[PDB]
Amino acid sequence: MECVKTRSVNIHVPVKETSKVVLECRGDSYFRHFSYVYWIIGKNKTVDQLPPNSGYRERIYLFKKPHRCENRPRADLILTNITDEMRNEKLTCVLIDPKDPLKESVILSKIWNCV
Amino acid sequence: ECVKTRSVNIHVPVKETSKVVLECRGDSYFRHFSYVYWIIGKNKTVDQLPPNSGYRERIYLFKKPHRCENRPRADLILTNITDEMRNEKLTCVLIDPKDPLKESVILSKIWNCVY
Amino acid sequence: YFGKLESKLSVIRNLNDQVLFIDQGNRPLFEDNAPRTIFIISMYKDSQPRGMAVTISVASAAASTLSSENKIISFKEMNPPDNIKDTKSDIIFFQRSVPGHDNKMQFESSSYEGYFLASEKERDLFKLILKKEDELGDRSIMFTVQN
Amino acid sequence: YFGKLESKLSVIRNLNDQVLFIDQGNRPLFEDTIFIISMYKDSQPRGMAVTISVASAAASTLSSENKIISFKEMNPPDNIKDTKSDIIFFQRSVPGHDNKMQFESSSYEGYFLASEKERDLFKLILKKLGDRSIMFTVQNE
């Protein structure tokens, strides 16, 4: 049966801050061989691009096999030693496939305070 | 050199989809006697719910403790979401030989955060 | 509501290190391998979370479950059930750690609040019984659980 | 910024099903063989940044340098510190035809890989709606 064609990106956030904060970005693309997710900090900076020991850490899962009707890539963003800068920083995950990039972004402060 | 931590936390999706998963994770140094689970609204375990209500609980087992803590997990899974479910008080509980630890959440309040 | 989750093979001792066990008359006692010695602690989830709801059953037994019914200690012929539809039960105990002593556990009855499992000497017997707490640090209501 | 990620053994064909390949003179051509598409992450996400290299023992990497098609003797690099590169192409799907791919140059926007006949030769070239000559299929394992 023809697999159904989904393209999605989503972030799972913690409802409260801790000393280690992990953000789970998960992708969903039917482009099984050509889809992946990753984080951009603020406006245009991949984690690689950051000053060393800045508190951000990216974990991109690999060897992660695609399922039958989609690839489901994942990239966790990891915050230690949190500064208010980081608390108000715009954090964005991107889905990249042979289609126009999909983004979901978030500001932690706004969430921890949306209560 | 074990440090003694007791914690419970929920990871929520920043936006609604057709399948919504909530990740409740526990942290207790009571390696052999700690677990997490969900209570819907006021006093209802998922087991206690009308069948096909949209809630589904997945409690991870065979999930071995680490050296200095047990890190149990229970995922709450929402399909066919109704406004009721969107405003329902969802709570995860850590149970160990100490007073129970709770973190709760209302999805609408989180998704309805604009900035 | 109680929901049965996991279960653990366990050895229970009093603070004199006497091993809990069952004789041939089904009497819970303490002495100093054996099928009788091993127990199964089964954890339960709770609609009204107040601690760690557990049942205590004998491992090597068809159906032998500890009960605090009528404020006495017994073994009912039954297995710990998949769910209990009440806020309290004669076979449900809250397993709580002794303050300052995380390696020590107390077992308060759910149907009879303020009543705990205890080791009591009677002649040359050490029996398992149910008793009130009153003052604290009563070492008689403290146990070690192994695995 | 371009960050190298995952890489795929790939066979590329034009819309007449001619297989892309390299002769002994390092000419990219189409006949009736195996390449490595490497995906990169992007500081300025505009599509799927990829490199195309020959799955050889050799170092061979497709380049759109000076608006011509070449193979630079080099491996696709772990990172590129620029917003564009002569070896970086955006791999985008043909609208309405998800099984079809186009390759726009990053250094020369509006320029795509294309299959062009010559005299008796189908050669891969660079070229400035619905042009089937800039459409390809990519096959994977």
Author numbering:
A (entry chain C): 19 to 133
B (entry chain A): 20 to 134
C (entry chain B): 1 to 32, 41 to 155
D (entry chain D): 1 to 32, 45 to 140, 144 to 156
How does the study describe this entry?
IL18 is a pro-inflammatory cytokine belonging to the interleukin 1 superfamily and plays an important role in both innate and acquired immune responses by inducing interferon-γ (IFN-γ) production from T lymphocytes and macrophages while also enhancing the cytotoxicity of natural killer cells. Mammals and poxviruses encode homologous inhibitory proteins of IL18, named IL18BPs, which regulate IL18 activity and, in the case of the viral proteins, contribute to virulence. To understand the mechanism by which yatapoxvirus IL18BPs neutralize IL18, we solved the high-resolution crystal structure of the Yaba-Like Disease Virus (YLDV) IL18BP:IL18 complex. The structure of the complex shows that the YLDV-IL18BP forms a homo-dimer in a back-to-back fashion, with each protomer binding to a molecule of IL18, forming a hetero-tetramer complex with a stoichiometry of 2∶2.
We found that the use of an IL18 mutant [IL18 (8S), see Materials and Methods], containing substitutions of the four-cysteines with serines and substitutions of four surface residues opposite to the IL18BP binding interface with alanines, greatly improved crystal quality and reproducibility. The crystal structure of IL18 (8S) in complex with YLDV-IL18BP was determined to 2.7 Å. The two structures are essentially identical to each other with a root mean square deviation (r.m.s.d) of less than 0.4 Å, and the three mutated cysteines in YLDV-IL18BP are distant from the IL18 binding interface. YLDV-IL18BP contains five cysteine residues, forming two intra-molecular disulfide bonds (SS) (C21–C87, C43–C111) and one inter-molecular SS bond (C132–C132), in contrast to only two intra-molecular SS bonds in ECTV-IL18BP. The homo-dimer interface involves mainly βA, βB, βH and the C-terminal helix H3. It involves extensive hydrophobic interactions in the center (I29, H30, V31, P32 and V33 from βA, the aliphatic side chain of E122, V124 from βH and I129 from H3) flanked by hydrogen bonding and charge-charge interactions, burying approximately 1,700 Å2 and 1,465 Å2 solvent accessible surface area (ASA) for the wild-type complex and the triple-cysteine mutant complex, respectively. The inter-chain C132-C132 SS bond covalently links the two promoters. Indeed, a non-reducing SDS-PAGE showed that YLDV-IL18BP proteins expressed in E. coli or in mammalian cells formed disulfide-bonded dimers. In contrast, YLDV-IL18BP forms a disulfide-bonded dimer, which was demonstrated not only in the crystal structure but also in solution by non-reducing SDS-PAGE and gel filtration analysis. The dimer interface is quite large (about 1,700 Å2) and involves extensive hydrophobic interactions in addition to the intermolecular disulfide bond, indicating that the YLDV-IL18BP dimer is intrinsically stable in solution.
